[PDB]
Amino acid sequence: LGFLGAAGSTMGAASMTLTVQARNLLHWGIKQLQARVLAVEHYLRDQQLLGIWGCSGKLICCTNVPWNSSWSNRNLSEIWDNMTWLQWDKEISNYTQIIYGLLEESQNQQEKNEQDLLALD
Amino acid sequence: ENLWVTVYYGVPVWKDAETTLFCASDAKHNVWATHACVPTDPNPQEIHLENVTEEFNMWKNNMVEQMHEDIISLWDQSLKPCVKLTPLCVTLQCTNVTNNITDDMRGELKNCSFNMTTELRDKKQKVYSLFYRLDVVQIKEYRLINCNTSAITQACPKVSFEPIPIHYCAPAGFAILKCKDKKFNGTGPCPSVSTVQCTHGIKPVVSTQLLLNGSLAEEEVIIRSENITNNAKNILVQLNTPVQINCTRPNNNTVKSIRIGPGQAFYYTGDIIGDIRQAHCNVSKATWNETLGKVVKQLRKHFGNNTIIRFAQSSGGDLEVTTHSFNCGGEFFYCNTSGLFNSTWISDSITLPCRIKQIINMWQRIGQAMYAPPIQGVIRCVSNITGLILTRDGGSTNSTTETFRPGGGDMRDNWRSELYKYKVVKIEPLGVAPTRCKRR
Amino acid sequence: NITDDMRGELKNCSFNMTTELRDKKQKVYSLFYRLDVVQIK
Ligand SMILES: *[C@@H]1O[C@H](CO)[C@@H](O[C@@H]2O[C@H](CO)[C@@H](O)[C@H](O)[C@H]2NC(C)=O)[C@H](O)[C@H]1NC(C)=O
Numbered sequence: 001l002g003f004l005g006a007a008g009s010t011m012g013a014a015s016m017t018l019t020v021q022a023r024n025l026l027h028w029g030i031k032q033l034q035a036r037v038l039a040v041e042h043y044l045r046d047q048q049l050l051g052i053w054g055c056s057g058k059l060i061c062c063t064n065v066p067w068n069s070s071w072s073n074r075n076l077s078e079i080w081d082n083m084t085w086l087q088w089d090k091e092i093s094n095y096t097q098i099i100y101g102l103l104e105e106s107q108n109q110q111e112k113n114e115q116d117l118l119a120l121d
Numbered sequence: 122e123n124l125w126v127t128v129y130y131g132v133p134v135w136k137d138a139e140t141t142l143f144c145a146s147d148a149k150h151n152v153w154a155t156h157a158c159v160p161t162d163p164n165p166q167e168i169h170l171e172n173v174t175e176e177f178n179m180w181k182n183n184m185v186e187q188m189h190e191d192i193i194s195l196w197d198q199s200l201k202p203c204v205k206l207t208p209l210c211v212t213l214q215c216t217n218v219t220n221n222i223t224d225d226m227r228g229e230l231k232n233c234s235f236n237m238t239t240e241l242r243d244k245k246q247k248v249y250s251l252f253y254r255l256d257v258v259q260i261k262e263y264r265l266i267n268c269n270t271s272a273i274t275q276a277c278p279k280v281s282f283e284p285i286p287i288h289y290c291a292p293a294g295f296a297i298l299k300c301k302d303k304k305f306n307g308t309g310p311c312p313s314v315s316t317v318q319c320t321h322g323i324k325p326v327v328s329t330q331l332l333l334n335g336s337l338a339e340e341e342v343i344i345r346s347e348n349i350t351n352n353a354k355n356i357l358v359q360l361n362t363p364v365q366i367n368c369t370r371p372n373n374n375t376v377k378s379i380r381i382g383p384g385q386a387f388y389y390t391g392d393i394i395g396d397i398r399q400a401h402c403n404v405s406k407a408t409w410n411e412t413l414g415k416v417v418k419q420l421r422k423h424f425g426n427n428t429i430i431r432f433a434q435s436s437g438g439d440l441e442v443t444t445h446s447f448n449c450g451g452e453f454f455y456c457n458t459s460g461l462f463n464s465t466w467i468s469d470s471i472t473l474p475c476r477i478k479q480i481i482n483m484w485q486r487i488g489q490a491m492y493a494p495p496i497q498g499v500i501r502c503v504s505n506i507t508g509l510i511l512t513r514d515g516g517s518t519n520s521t522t523e524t525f526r527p528g529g530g531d532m533r534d535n536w537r538s539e540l541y542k543y544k545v546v547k548i549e550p551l552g553v554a555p556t557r558c559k560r561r
Numbered sequence: 562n563i564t565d566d567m568r569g570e571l572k573n574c575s576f577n578m579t580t581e582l583r584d585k586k587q588k589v590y591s592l593f594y595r596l597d598v599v600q601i602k
Pocket residue numbers: 215216217227228261
């Protein structure tokens with residue numbers, strides 16, 4: 001139940017601890033400051049990705065991008081109940097930049113226009 | 122079916138990473154980290170990670186390099202306010218000491234005198250003091266060692282050299298993983314892994330050919346090296362039992378001091394009270410005999426059956442690697458380890474002679490040197506061996522025998538014995554998943 | 562063997578230089594350019 005205690009759990013079970021994990025993400029004087037400044041910058045960059053996706057208000061969100069299952073031939077029960085997040089991250093390591101690009105371009109660009117059109121009238 | 126991309130934040134996934142670690146200590150002046158660091162967490166936390174097989178590799182561990190640079194910079198800061206001895210490079214005429222002496226190699230201790238400056242630019246004084254042979258080179262006329270190679274700085278006498286434990290703690294967004302598996306050889310997957318906010322305290326103990334005052338193996342002697350088949354590589358051996366070291370300097374030396382210039386003072390060895398005797402360190406014969414037998418058994422597992430294993434003294438190199446260095450009371454000792462390695466294996470105490478040197482260069486840097494102030498009175502020092510550094514004379518395929526000799530000369534190898542347990546990782550909270558869902 | 566330059570441009574000079582030990586001095590000589598040296602010979 002502690003930090004990274006979920007590492008051995010299944011991906012579904014691990015979802016219970018997401019909030020706990022979030023709380024822990026946030027001459028020698030120069031070295032110490034560089035570590036702290038970078039920790040802040042890295043945190044903010046991840047928040048920006050969520051802000052573009054519109055997911056920044058939640059730990060969990062859905063998107064309008066289809067899964068394209070040919071990326072990995074597995075069932076949902078095979079993924080969620082029989083595998084860890086550590087293993088999963090390796091399975092899709094070659095598709096991560098693709099998925100992020102799809103979310104920023106294929107979803108946000110359509111949503112902002114439809115919302116503006118409703119606002120205009 | 123109709124699967125969709127979803128996004129999760131706070132996901133418990135980590136990647137290998139390197140970052141600055143924050144020094145802390147549980148700890149009046151000392152050369153060590155207590156002046157450069159902050160208090161530790163009084164109750165460190167640990168979380169076991171179930172079903173985790175995370176790989177460790179001590180030979181690639183960047184924490185070793187980070188500690189090295191912090192230790193060197195830390196040590197140098199202690200000499201910045203201290204006295205310069207540049208005025209002392211002089212003709213330095215000397216003669217042999219005559220006294221009630223059991224001595225050592227003849228000429229080991231000398232009675233020297235020189236023309237030295239005073240508080241005033243207009244005046245000089247005649248002084249005399251004792252020096253060890255190791256610090257004096259013949260030009261009779263003499264020069265101090267390194268008078269033609271480097272400036273010499275006197276360490277401040279008020280500053281302690283006694284080791285103080287150092288802890289390292291992760292910055293936010295990072296975590297330190299620890300291998301708990303017993304009999305780990307420092308590489309490959311670790312069967313039991315846990316996460317800690319900070320490391321256990323590590324003392325900066327400096328020694329050669331033997332590892333002192335470190336951690337012990339939990340059950341049995343562990344032998345590890347970067348490449349067990351490569352004779353060039355140092356072999357670290359961690360003992361599962363302690364072996365003590367008892368060192369002493371019986372001579373009752375005295376200390377005198379003279380002011381030099383307006384801002385500086387010099388400390389030197391005065392007359393020695395009572396009989397003059399050789400400095401020495403004891404090693405238990407019975408304890409060492411058992412210790413070697415355990416090491417040999419483990420070596421056979423790595424080097425095969427029915428190989429005759431022998432030990433020997435180093436064939437060459439500088440005093441720094443051919444002898445065992447100590448720092449006791451701030452005095453620097455070099456001891457001849459022969460008789461500890463004088464054995465062949467097929468199937469009450471030892472006294473080692475020691476020598477004292479006042480001019481040292483702990484980090485083997487060219488152009489640097491330090492003069493220790495002499496310590497008044499009799500010194501006794503008790504410490505223990507927690508491991509050995511060995512190298513092979515082998516690599517030959519033409520023999521049924523093998524021989525080992527002591528290694529050393531690289532301080533980083535000592536720290537590996539405490540840091541092999543730890544790895545640093547970065548936490549990456551963002552990830553995605555296929556689960557079917559809908560949104561507006 | 563001199564084809565020279567502006568006359569006096571190169572100079573042959575000598576002095577008492579200090580040594581490794583505080584107790585001793587050494588005699589040396591060296592060449593200087595006229596621009597490097599000013600008369601106070
Ligand atoms: C102090 O006494 C020792 C012993 O007499 C001197 O060492 C000897 O030096 C001579 C002359 O070169 C040698 O022939 C001997 O073999 C040395 N004896 C040894 C090594 O036992 C030493 O030189 C003296 N020190 C001074 C500064 O005079």
